[PDB]
Design a protein around this nucleic acid. Sequence first.
RNA 1: CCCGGCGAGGGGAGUGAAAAAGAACCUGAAACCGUGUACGUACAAGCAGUGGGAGCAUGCUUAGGCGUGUGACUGCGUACC
RNA 2: UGUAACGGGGCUAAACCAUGCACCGAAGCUGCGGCAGCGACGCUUAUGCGUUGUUGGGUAGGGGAGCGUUCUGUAAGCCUGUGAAGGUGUACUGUGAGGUAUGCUGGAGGUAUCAGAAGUGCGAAUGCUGACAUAAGUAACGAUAAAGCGGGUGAAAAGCCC
Lengths: 109, 141, 150, 102, 55, 115
Amino acid sequence: METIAKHRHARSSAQKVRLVADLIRGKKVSQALDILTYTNKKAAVLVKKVLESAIANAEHNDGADIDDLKVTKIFVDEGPSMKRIMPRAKGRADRILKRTSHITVVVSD
Amino acid sequence: MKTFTAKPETVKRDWYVVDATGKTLGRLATELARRLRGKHKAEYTPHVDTGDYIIVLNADKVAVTGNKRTDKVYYHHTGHIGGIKQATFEEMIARRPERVIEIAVKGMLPKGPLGRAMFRKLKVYAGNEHNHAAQQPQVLD
Amino acid sequence: VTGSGKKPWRQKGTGRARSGSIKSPIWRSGGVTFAARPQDHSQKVNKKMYRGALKSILSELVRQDRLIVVEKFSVEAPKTKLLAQKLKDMALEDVLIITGELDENLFLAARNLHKVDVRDATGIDPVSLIAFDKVVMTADAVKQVEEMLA
Amino acid sequence: MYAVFQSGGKQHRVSEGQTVRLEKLDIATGETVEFAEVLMIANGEEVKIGVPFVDGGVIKAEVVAHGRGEKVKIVKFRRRKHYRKQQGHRQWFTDVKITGIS
Amino acid sequence: AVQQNKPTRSKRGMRRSHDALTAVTSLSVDKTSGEKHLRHHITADGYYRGRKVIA
Amino acid sequence: ARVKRGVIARARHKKILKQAKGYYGARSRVYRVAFQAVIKAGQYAYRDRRQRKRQFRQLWIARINAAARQNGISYSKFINGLKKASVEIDRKILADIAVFDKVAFTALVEKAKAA
RNA sequence: CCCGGCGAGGGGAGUGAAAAAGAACCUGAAACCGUGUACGUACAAGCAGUGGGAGCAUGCUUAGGCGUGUGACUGCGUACC
RNA sequence: UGUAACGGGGCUAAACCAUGCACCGAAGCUGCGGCAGCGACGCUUAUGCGUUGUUGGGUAGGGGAGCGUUCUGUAAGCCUGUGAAGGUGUACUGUGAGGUAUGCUGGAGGUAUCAGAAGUGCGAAUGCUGACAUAAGUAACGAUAAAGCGGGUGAAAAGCCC
Ligand SMILES: [Mg+2]
Ligand SMILES: [Mg+2]
Ligand SMILES: [Mg+2]
Ligand SMILES: [Mg+2]
Ligand SMILES: [Mg+2]
Ligand SMILES: [Mg+2]
Ligand SMILES: [Mg+2]
Ligand SMILES: [Mg+2]
Ligand SMILES: [Mg+2]
Ligand SMILES: [Mg+2]
Ligand SMILES: [Mg+2]
Ligand SMILES: [Mg+2]
Ligand SMILES: [Mg+2]
Ligand SMILES: [Mg+2]
Ligand SMILES: [Mg+2]
Ligand SMILES: [Mg+2]
Ligand SMILES: [Mg+2]
Ligand SMILES: [Mg+2]
Ligand SMILES: [Mg+2]
Ligand SMILES: [Mg+2]
Ligand SMILES: [Mg+2]
Ligand SMILES: [Mg+2]
Ligand SMILES: [Mg+2]
Ligand SMILES: [Mg+2]
Ligand SMILES: [Mg+2]
Ligand SMILES: [Mg+2]
Ligand SMILES: [Mg+2]
Ligand SMILES: [Mg+2]
Ligand SMILES: [Mg+2]
Ligand SMILES: [Mg+2]
Ligand SMILES: [Mg+2]
Ligand SMILES: [Mg+2]
Ligand SMILES: [Mg+2]
Ligand SMILES: [Mg+2]
Ligand SMILES: [Mg+2]
Ligand SMILES: [Mg+2]
Ligand SMILES: [Mg+2]
Ligand SMILES: [Mg+2]
Ligand SMILES: [Mg+2]
Ligand SMILES: [Mg+2]
Ligand SMILES: [Mg+2]
Ligand SMILES: [Mg+2]
Ligand SMILES: [Mg+2]
Ligand SMILES: [Mg+2]
Ligand SMILES: [Mg+2]
Ligand SMILES: [Mg+2]
Ligand SMILES: [Mg+2]
Ligand SMILES: [Mg+2]
Ligand SMILES: [Mg+2]
Ligand SMILES: [Mg+2]
Ligand SMILES: [Mg+2]
Ligand SMILES: [Mg+2]
Ligand SMILES: [Mg+2]
Ligand SMILES: [Mg+2]
Ligand SMILES: [Mg+2]
Ligand SMILES: [Mg+2]
Ligand SMILES: [Mg+2]
Ligand SMILES: [Mg+2]
Ligand SMILES: [Mg+2]
Ligand SMILES: [Mg+2]
Ligand SMILES: [Mg+2]
Ligand SMILES: [Mg+2]
Ligand SMILES: [Mg+2]
Ligand SMILES: [Mg+2]
Ligand SMILES: [Mg+2]
Ligand SMILES: [Mg+2]
Ligand SMILES: [Mg+2]
Ligand SMILES: [Mg+2]
Ligand SMILES: [Mg+2]
Ligand SMILES: [Mg+2]
Ligand SMILES: [Mg+2]
Ligand SMILES: [Mg+2]
Ligand SMILES: [Mg+2]
Ligand SMILES: [Mg+2]
Ligand SMILES: [Mg+2]
Ligand SMILES: [Mg+2]
Ligand SMILES: [Mg+2]
Ligand SMILES: [Mg+2]
Ligand SMILES: [Mg+2]
Ligand SMILES: [Mg+2]
Ligand SMILES: [Mg+2]
Ligand SMILES: [Mg+2]
Ligand SMILES: [Mg+2]
Ligand SMILES: [Mg+2]
Ligand SMILES: [Mg+2]
Ligand SMILES: [Mg+2]
Ligand SMILES: [Mg+2]
Ligand SMILES: [Mg+2]
Ligand SMILES: [Mg+2]
Ligand SMILES: [Mg+2]
Ligand SMILES: [Mg+2]
Ligand SMILES: [Mg+2]
Ligand SMILES: [Mg+2]
Ligand SMILES: [Mg+2]
Ligand SMILES: [Mg+2]
Ligand SMILES: [Mg+2]
Ligand SMILES: [Mg+2]
Ligand SMILES: [Mg+2]
Ligand SMILES: [Mg+2]
Ligand SMILES: [Mg+2]
Ligand SMILES: [Mg+2]
Ligand SMILES: [Mg+2]
Ligand SMILES: [Mg+2]
Ligand SMILES: [Mg+2]
Ligand SMILES: [Mg+2]
Ligand SMILES: [Mg+2]
Ligand SMILES: [Mg+2]
Ligand SMILES: [Mg+2]
Ligand SMILES: [Mg+2]
Ligand SMILES: [Mg+2]
Ligand SMILES: [Mg+2]
Ligand SMILES: [Mg+2]
Ligand SMILES: [Mg+2]
Ligand SMILES: [Mg+2]
Ligand SMILES: [Mg+2]
Ligand SMILES: [Mg+2]
Ligand SMILES: [Mg+2]
Ligand SMILES: [Mg+2]
Ligand SMILES: [Mg+2]
Ligand SMILES: [Mg+2]
Ligand SMILES: [Mg+2]
Ligand SMILES: [Mg+2]
Ligand SMILES: [Mg+2]
Ligand SMILES: [Mg+2]
Ligand SMILES: [Mg+2]
Ligand SMILES: [Mg+2]
Ligand SMILES: [Mg+2]
Ligand SMILES: [Mg+2]
Ligand SMILES: [Mg+2]
Ligand SMILES: [Mg+2]
Ligand SMILES: [Mg+2]
Ligand SMILES: [Mg+2]
Ligand SMILES: [Mg+2]
Ligand SMILES: [Mg+2]
Ligand SMILES: [Mg+2]
Ligand SMILES: [Mg+2]
Ligand SMILES: [Mg+2]
Ligand SMILES: [Mg+2]
Ligand SMILES: [Mg+2]
Ligand SMILES: [Mg+2]
Ligand SMILES: [Mg+2]
Ligand SMILES: [Mg+2]
Ligand SMILES: [Mg+2]
Ligand SMILES: [Mg+2]
Ligand SMILES: [Mg+2]
Ligand SMILES: [Mg+2]
Ligand SMILES: [Mg+2]
Ligand SMILES: [Mg+2]
Ligand SMILES: [Mg+2]
Ligand SMILES: [Mg+2]
Ligand SMILES: [Mg+2]
Ligand SMILES: [Mg+2]
Ligand SMILES: [Mg+2]
Ligand SMILES: [Mg+2]
Ligand SMILES: [Mg+2]
Ligand SMILES: [Mg+2]
Ligand SMILES: [Mg+2]
Ligand SMILES: [Mg+2]
Ligand SMILES: [Mg+2]
Ligand SMILES: [Mg+2]
Ligand SMILES: [Mg+2]
Ligand SMILES: [Mg+2]
Ligand SMILES: [Mg+2]
Ligand SMILES: [Mg+2]
Ligand SMILES: [Mg+2]
Ligand SMILES: [Mg+2]
Ligand SMILES: [Mg+2]
Ligand SMILES: [Mg+2]
Ligand SMILES: [Mg+2]
Ligand SMILES: [Mg+2]
Ligand SMILES: [Mg+2]
Ligand SMILES: [Mg+2]
Ligand SMILES: [Mg+2]
C-alpha cells in the first residue's frame, strides 16, 4: 500500500512549504512527526497536519501498523495564485499574488 | 569504417629520462613536448593523452645561445593594480631552475584540460638524482 | 466596430507601443483588416459556351450509356410507391427523369424520392446531367432539347 | 588474411568474411562482384605492389543489400540577408560480404 | 539596480543550495516521565530534569 | 471561411522543439530560442561534413608520420617513395595498417626506400 | 465511516459506463513549477552548439555487435531580426 | 591598467640571399555514387532516354512547380463505440513544404479522389488579450505615543476580553 493524503489550496507558497518537506523524505513516520513539532515554521504545522492525516488515513482504511511506515513521496506543487491590487506611490498599482500550494504526502512501507 | 582511436584504459605509458646538461632549451623543450603529447607513437589520438612520462634531470645546466643568458626575460603579472614582475634567464636559474623547462614546454603544449594533463607527465629536476627509480625510467636522447 | 476614436494613452511619454484606436485590427476585440462585404460570386457564361458544354456533356452520355431514351414515361396516380416499384423493372436508382410534358402526378410522386429528380425538358442543367448516374429522357423531351440546343 | 581494394573511388581494408558497406554498384540484389582492383594482400608474407594493383589477386564478394543511408539534413542560412534553404539527402549504398581473398 | 538579462533555473537553484534548513536530530528524554523535548527546554506537560517545577 | 491556426502552428513548433531536444535551458524548451539553435546546428552540421574530411586526413597523416619515423623515414620522403614506386594506397589505410600490422607496415617503408 | 477546529481539505465507501466526469466539474497543449530512476557534473574560461570520441547505463537480437539515454576529453565555432 | 611592435613557446638557424627536388594545404581539380535546370542528338516520337554536352553562390527583384490549412461540390457515398477529431509518443517514408502506420489519452465525429473559394501558414511590429516566469522568498508591512505581567475563552493568544 501507499495511502495518500493531501492539502489542496494550502495558504502558503510552494517555495516555503517545500523547504519543510525536504526535512521529511524517506524518514520513519514516528521520527517525521517529531521534527515538525520542533521545526520553527508555519509550514511545519501545515505539512504535519497532512502527514498525521496520512497515517490515520493509512491505518484505518488500508495498511495498519504505525512502526513500519515511511514518508516515501512528499511533494509540494504550486497551486492557483489569487491576484490582489497593492497601490504604490505616484499613482501606480502592483498586482500582488497570494500564492497557494498543493501539499501531498505518501506513507508507504 | 570507424578508424582506430586510442582508448585511455588500453594506453600503455612508458617512462624516460633526459639529461639536459648542455642542451639547447628550445630544441630540448620541443622534443619533450612532442613526446609528452604522444606524437611519436603510431597510435596518436589528439583527444587522448597517449604520450610518455619523462624525467628531465639537470635542468639548471641547460644551455642557451647568444646573449639570452642575460637578455631573455620572463615577464608575469601578479594580477595586481600595477604589478608586472620580470626575471632574466640568469635570475630565473638563480631562484627556480625547474620553471625554465616548465615554461618552455608549457608554451609548446596545447592549451586546455588535456594540455594540462600532458604537462603533469613531465618531471623536471635541478639535481642529478631522481626519486623515480621505481618505474625503471630508461635513458632517452 | 463599436468604440470611440479616442487614443487610450498618448503618443509619447509612457513606455508603451503607440496606439491610435481600440478598434485597430492588431488589437483584440476590434478590427478585421479586410472585412468581407456581401458580394455576388455569379460569373458570366457565353450562350454558345453554355450550349456547347451541354452539347459536350449530353453527347458523352451516349458513349457512356447513361442516357436512357424512352417513349411515354408517366406514373398512373400521384403515388411514390408505384414510381419506386416501376424503376425496379427498369433497373434504375439515381436518375434524372427529363420530360417534355411535365406531369404533376409524376412530379409529386418523385419529390420524396432522393436519388430521383424530375426536371422539365426545358429546365435541364449542366451539373444535373453530370451528377445523376443515369438520365431518362422522353422522346418528346429529346425532340425539345434537340431544338433548344440546336 | 586481410586485403586492400579500391571500389567507390575509395579503398577498403577488408578481411575474409565480414560485411562491408560501399558505394552503390550497378548489380542485382543477390548476384556477385569481382574486384580485380586489389592493392594489397597481407598474410604470413605480404604481397605489396610496385605497380598499379597486384597481379593475380581478385576479391570475390556477394551483394547483401541495396538500401539507403540515414537522412542528412542540409541547412544553408545567410544571416540578415533574408535567405535560407532546406534539403534532405539519403545516400545509396551496397553492402557486400567478402567470399574470397585470393 | 536592475538585471541586464534574466538569470536561469540553474542560478536560482545555485543560490538556493544554502536555503535548506536543518532538523533538530537532538531530542531529549525526561528522567521520570520519559517525554521528548528540546535540550535545556521544559516539556509540554511541565517537566525539566525529572522534577515538577511548574503548575 | 475563417481559418483557425492552432492545430498547425503547434505541429510546426513541436517539430522544431523535437530537433532542439538535448540543448541547454531555453534552447530546448522555448521555440523562439530553439529555432535559432536548430538552424545554427544545421549550419554547423553542413560546415562540419567538410571539416570531418579535413580532420581525419590530418589524423591519418600524423599516424603515418609517427609510424614512419619509428622505421627511420619522414612522411614527406615516405609518400614520395610510395608515389615513385606507383603505390596507390591512401592515408586512411596506411594509418590503419600503421596501428594494426606494423610488421606489414615495415615492408611499405622498405618499398619506399627503394625509390 | 476516518484525520482535522462538530473548519478547510483529504482517504474511504457509494452513484455512473467512466469520479485523474466530484461541481475550482468534456477535451486539458505550451510556457512555468515539481517527485523519483540512468548517466554526467566541485583545476576549470566565452552564442553553449557542432564533427570526432572513451567509458557508463539500459533495449535487443548474442556466442559480432547494433539501437537508446548520457557526453570525459578534443578540432571548428561572436545568437536572430 | 599587463610582457604587449614574430599570434605564442621558443630559435645563431626554426633569420636572410640563392638554387634543388620533397611534402602539407581549399567546398579548387580528378575518382565513385545521387538529383535537377537548359542545349543539341537519333530523330526517338508526341517524350522516355543509348543519350549528349553543359550548368546548378546569391540581396533587391523577375520567371517556373508544389505542400499544407478551414470551407462548397463529388458525399443520404466512404472511414468510424471492434473507438472519430483533438492531445501525446514511437517507427517508416519523400528533394522540401510534409505524408503514412501505429502505442497511450480522448469519448464523437471525420472525410478519399479530382475540381471550386479563401478571415490560408507569424518570431520579431517599445504589436493586442490571457497565463506564467525573473529580480526574490529580496524590499517593504505606512509616523520613534511604549509597553509589561496575570487570568479568561479557544484547536491555537504579543495583538481579542477582563
Ligand atoms: Mg487558512
Ligand atoms: Mg533539495
Ligand atoms: Mg510558510
Ligand atoms: Mg499558479
Ligand atoms: Mg507606498
Ligand atoms: Mg498618475
Ligand atoms: Mg612598485
Ligand atoms: Mg588551438
Ligand atoms: Mg466597445
Ligand atoms: Mg477622432
Ligand atoms: Mg476629438
Ligand atoms: Mg521605453
Ligand atoms: Mg468584447
Ligand atoms: Mg470583432
Ligand atoms: Mg483582426
Ligand atoms: Mg464577387
Ligand atoms: Mg472575381
Ligand atoms: Mg451573369
Ligand atoms: Mg442570358
Ligand atoms: Mg448517389
Ligand atoms: Mg426551373
Ligand atoms: Mg555511369
Ligand atoms: Mg533582405
Ligand atoms: Mg524548411
Ligand atoms: Mg542591454
Ligand atoms: Mg540585453
Ligand atoms: Mg531543475
Ligand atoms: Mg539565501
Ligand atoms: Mg540523524
Ligand atoms: Mg470554421
Ligand atoms: Mg497561433
Ligand atoms: Mg504547442
Ligand atoms: Mg498528430
Ligand atoms: Mg514558425
Ligand atoms: Mg508538444
Ligand atoms: Mg546529445
Ligand atoms: Mg548534452
Ligand atoms: Mg517546450
Ligand atoms: Mg520540454
Ligand atoms: Mg580525403
Ligand atoms: Mg480522533
Ligand atoms: Mg475553532
Ligand atoms: Mg462541538
Ligand atoms: Mg468529533
Ligand atoms: Mg472538500
Ligand atoms: Mg469535508
Ligand atoms: Mg474530497
Ligand atoms: Mg461502487
Ligand atoms: Mg457501479
Ligand atoms: Mg461497473
Ligand atoms: Mg472503454
Ligand atoms: Mg479510469
Ligand atoms: Mg469510484
Ligand atoms: Mg479512481
Ligand atoms: Mg473506479
Ligand atoms: Mg482522463
Ligand atoms: Mg473524462
Ligand atoms: Mg475525491
Ligand atoms: Mg465541493
Ligand atoms: Mg471553491
Ligand atoms: Mg467552473
Ligand atoms: Mg483548472
Ligand atoms: Mg460529451
Ligand atoms: Mg483530462
Ligand atoms: Mg493537467
Ligand atoms: Mg477536466
Ligand atoms: Mg495530457
Ligand atoms: Mg504541461
Ligand atoms: Mg512537451
Ligand atoms: Mg520548464
Ligand atoms: Mg528543483
Ligand atoms: Mg525536472
Ligand atoms: Mg529534482
Ligand atoms: Mg552521479
Ligand atoms: Mg592548474
Ligand atoms: Mg574535474
Ligand atoms: Mg565560465
Ligand atoms: Mg582561453
Ligand atoms: Mg576562445
Ligand atoms: Mg553532438
Ligand atoms: Mg557524434
Ligand atoms: Mg557498457
Ligand atoms: Mg573543444
Ligand atoms: Mg580559432
Ligand atoms: Mg559560436
Ligand atoms: Mg562571426
Ligand atoms: Mg598598459
Ligand atoms: Mg609598460
Ligand atoms: Mg605581442
Ligand atoms: Mg610578444
Ligand atoms: Mg601599445
Ligand atoms: Mg618598441
Ligand atoms: Mg610602445
Ligand atoms: Mg607567426
Ligand atoms: Mg611561423
Ligand atoms: Mg652554417
Ligand atoms: Mg624571405
Ligand atoms: Mg614537386
Ligand atoms: Mg578536399
Ligand atoms: Mg568536391
Ligand atoms: Mg565544384
Ligand atoms: Mg533535366
Ligand atoms: Mg565541352
Ligand atoms: Mg558554383
Ligand atoms: Mg541560385
Ligand atoms: Mg535594396
Ligand atoms: Mg506534385
Ligand atoms: Mg493545396
Ligand atoms: Mg491532405
Ligand atoms: Mg486534415
Ligand atoms: Mg466538403
Ligand atoms: Mg449544403
Ligand atoms: Mg464516386
Ligand atoms: Mg441512409
Ligand atoms: Mg467507395
Ligand atoms: Mg472502404
Ligand atoms: Mg461499404
Ligand atoms: Mg460499432
Ligand atoms: Mg467500450
Ligand atoms: Mg475488439
Ligand atoms: Mg481495438
Ligand atoms: Mg484498445
Ligand atoms: Mg484515424
Ligand atoms: Mg471540423
Ligand atoms: Mg486527419
Ligand atoms: Mg491526432
Ligand atoms: Mg492508433
Ligand atoms: Mg499494426
Ligand atoms: Mg487509428
Ligand atoms: Mg493509462
Ligand atoms: Mg484514464
Ligand atoms: Mg469518458
Ligand atoms: Mg460524454
Ligand atoms: Mg476509454
Ligand atoms: Mg454527430
Ligand atoms: Mg471534399
Ligand atoms: Mg484547387
Ligand atoms: Mg484542393
Ligand atoms: Mg482562389
Ligand atoms: Mg475567383
Ligand atoms: Mg492571416
Ligand atoms: Mg513575424
Ligand atoms: Mg520561424
Ligand atoms: Mg520576420
Ligand atoms: Mg512579440
Ligand atoms: Mg520593457
Ligand atoms: Mg507583446
Ligand atoms: Mg520570483
Ligand atoms: Mg521569510
Ligand atoms: Mg523575512
Ligand atoms: Mg538582492
Ligand atoms: Mg537586504
Ligand atoms: Mg528589511
Ligand atoms: Mg515600520
Ligand atoms: Mg504600524
Ligand atoms: Mg516620522
Ligand atoms: Mg485573575
Ligand atoms: Mg491565558
Ligand atoms: Mg490557573
Ligand atoms: Mg487558562
Ligand atoms: Mg480553556
Ligand atoms: Mg482549550
Ligand atoms: Mg492544544
Ligand atoms: Mg485542547
Ligand atoms: Mg475543547
Ligand atoms: Mg498550548
Ligand atoms: Mg497576555
Ligand atoms: Mg508589541
Ligand atoms: Mg502591539
Ligand atoms: Mg492591546
Ligand atoms: Mg482594541
Ligand atoms: Mg466586554
Ligand atoms: Mg488590555
